[PDB]
Design a protein around this ligand. Structure first.
Ligand code: FAD
Ligand code: NAP
Length: 528
């Protein structure tokens, strides 16, 4: 039998739509599936207050850089959520990609049929579509997780996870008169807290673990600046392609030690005050390899925190003692620390006083009871493998991807897994495009995968699968490379339990390997 489609593409985020656009451009037969109503992925689903980019607007905007929508105008340096979703909507316009997709449709199971080298894809547990290739663009921080606390449903006020804010108008942003509780202090939390506190009656922050945070330094984007940028897109494109993360920054050649304390102190101050992630991704070459170098930056930020926070007890509570700087994603913020100087904001430490349960009134903890009219769960995601974990995926010998990855992910190039022929996990585990400015990183990964499906059509090949030795060596390489950094000393979302779900070596290096595989007739894959 013959599968109907060349490929199915799961997801309508920035990765998914481009993937889908490209495939169809090459004249193949594609269907996209999105669970929500329309394109946007991250930018569709995450409508909470203060939701904002990390990455410079113009560096994230692959779609603009590649002249798909060259005339696009950014209004700020770090675009808000609504602006992003506008961009994606426009981008999809010029691609004409919507007609290729099934919206309001969820993939629930996927089964490989050895005997026909195809994939049988189940939509909302009834209908079945057949494709030669399954391509997941279901993204690294899709798949929300509620924390493991007793009695979440026992709560009688308003309550929800950050990625399912009530609504397409973000309803009830105004917390006038309300007692609000916020669980979690990651990137989401840090964006939410200063904003809610403008209107909340009382704001209690339930912080189990403190992150290192630094000033976003957002500012609006003059039309001149935007003209000066669009004129350089070719340069900006090449440049972001050459940096380890595809963010527009690169390391100082020097070590932390080749420089006297007073020279370091000056260099850090200059970064601290620079808009964006310069502090994190333009430090010294050994910020993430060398405990001593890390300590230097960590003490500087510490000191900064005690400047911005008036009461020294609160301030100490907010300074991490337990993981080196830049080991977890560094959340960037507007006026976060100053928030704690407010009379109507309370930091509740829930490591020393672990949350007992959620009651109808408020939140019980080992020490106190909090009456609350609203609770916010900024508790993050089932990272990387999470949304795949939520599809029954089955391969050769009817094995599940979940059992397959039970000891941790195993893939070649982070693109295919052994036992799962003709299946591409885009920006998935052990992938060089996951620790990235994903806007550019996944654009490039979508393009490479196109070139592999194209190589397959031309040579009439119907089957692709990693060899054992390919996959073992790769995985080995990924753990090896990761154990060398201070990223090993931490529990970020990209760690599972202590192992990595992700590839930390450099994008340009990762892509260089990929090019070396593709050139050598996809060496490491069995093809037939
Ligand atoms: C709040 C937030 C802010 C971020 N900010 C940045 C940033 O500034 N810079 C950066 O580089 N990265 C950022 N990221 C990381 C982000 O994941 C990437 O930037 C990018 O959005 C990933 O896009 P994607 O299209 O690959 O996945 P997504 O954007 O998540 O899109 C995946 C889509 O797949 C759909 N889907 C999943 N499962 C199914 C199912 N089985 N059936 C049907 N559809 C399904 C989902 O509905 C979703 O729409 C951020 C992430 C979050 C959560
Ligand atoms: N552009 C941006 O600046 C932007 C904005 C938002 C999100 N993001 C992306 O989204 C990622 C996820 O960040 P997030 O804040 O959404 O999630 P996150 O980084 O995973 O943080 C989740 C928070 O909830 C807490 N938590 C989880 N389970 C808990 C439990 N059982 N009890 C008590 N506390 C619990 C965690 O504390 P513990 O550490 O103790 O587990 C952590 O503080 C970021 O790394 C970032 O890449 C980016």
């Amino acid at each position: 039998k013959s599968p109907a489609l060349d490929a199915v593409v799961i997801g309508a985020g920035v990765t998914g739509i481009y993937q889908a656009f490209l495939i169809n451009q090459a004249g193949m037969k594609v269907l996209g599936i999105e669970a929500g109503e329309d394109v946007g992925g991250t930018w569709y689903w995450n409508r909470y207050p203060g939701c904002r980019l990390d990455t410079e607007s113009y560096a994230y905007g692959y779609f603009a850089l590649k002249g798909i929508i060259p005339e696009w105008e950014w209004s700020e340096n770090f675009a808000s959520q609504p602006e992003m979703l506008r961009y994606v909507n426009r981008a999809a316009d010029a691609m004409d990609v919507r007609k290729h997709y099934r919206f309001n449709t969820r993939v629930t199971a996927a089964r490989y049929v050895e005997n026909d080298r195809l994939w049988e894809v189940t939509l909302d547990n009834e209908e079945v579509v057949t494709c030669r290739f399954l391509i997941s663009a279901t993204g690294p921080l899709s798949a929300s997780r509620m924390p493991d606390i007793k009695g979440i449903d026992s709560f009688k006020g308003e309550s929800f996870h950050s990625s399912r804010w009530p609504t397409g108008a973000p309803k009830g942003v105004d917390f006038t008169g309300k007692r609000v509780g916020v669980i979690g202090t990651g990137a989401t939390g840090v964006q939410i807290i200063p904003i809610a506190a403008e209107t909340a009656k009382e704001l209690y922050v339930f912080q189990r673990t403190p992150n290192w945070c630094t000033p976003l330094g957002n500012s609006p984007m003059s039309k001149e600046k935007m003209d000066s940028l669009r004129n350089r897109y070719p340069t900006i494109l090449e440049y972001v392609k050459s940096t380890d993360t595809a963010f527009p920054y690169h390391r100082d050649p020097r070590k932390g030690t080749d420089v006297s304390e007073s020279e370091r102190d000056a260099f850090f101050e200059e970064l601290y005050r620079q808009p964006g992630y310069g502090i994190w991704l333009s430090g010294f070459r050994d910020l993430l390899l060398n405990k001593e170098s890390n300590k230097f930056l960590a003490d500087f930020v510490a000191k900064k925190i005690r400047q911005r926070v008036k009461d020294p007890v609160v301030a100490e509570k907010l300074i991490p003692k337990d993981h080196p700087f830049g080991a977890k994603r560094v959340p960037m913020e507007t006026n976060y620390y100053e928030t704690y100087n407010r009379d109507n904001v309370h930091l509740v430490d829930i490591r020393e006083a672990p949350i007992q349960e959620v009651t109808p009134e408020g939140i019980k903890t080992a020490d106190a009871a909090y009456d609350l009219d609203v609770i916010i769960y900024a508790t993050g995601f089932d990272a990387v493998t999470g949304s795949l974990d939520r599809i029954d995926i089955r391969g050769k010998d009817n094995v599940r991807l979940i059992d397959a990855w039970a000891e941790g992910p195993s893939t070649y190039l982070g693109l295919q897994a052994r036992g799962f022929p003709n299946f591409f996990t885009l920006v998935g585990p052990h992938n060089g495009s996951t620790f990235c400015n994903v806007g550019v990183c996944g654009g490039l990964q979508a393009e490479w995968v196109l070139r592999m499906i194209s190589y397959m059509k031309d040579n009439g090949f119907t089957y692709s699968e990693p060899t054992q030795a390919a996959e073992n060596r790769w995985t080995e390489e990924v753990y090896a490379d990761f154990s060398r950094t201070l990223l090993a000393e931490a529990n970020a979302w990209w760690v599972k339990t202590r192992r990595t779900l992700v590839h930390v070596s450099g994008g340009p290096e990762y892509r260089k390997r990929c090019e070396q595989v593709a050139y050598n007739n996809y060496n490491g894959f069995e093809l037939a």
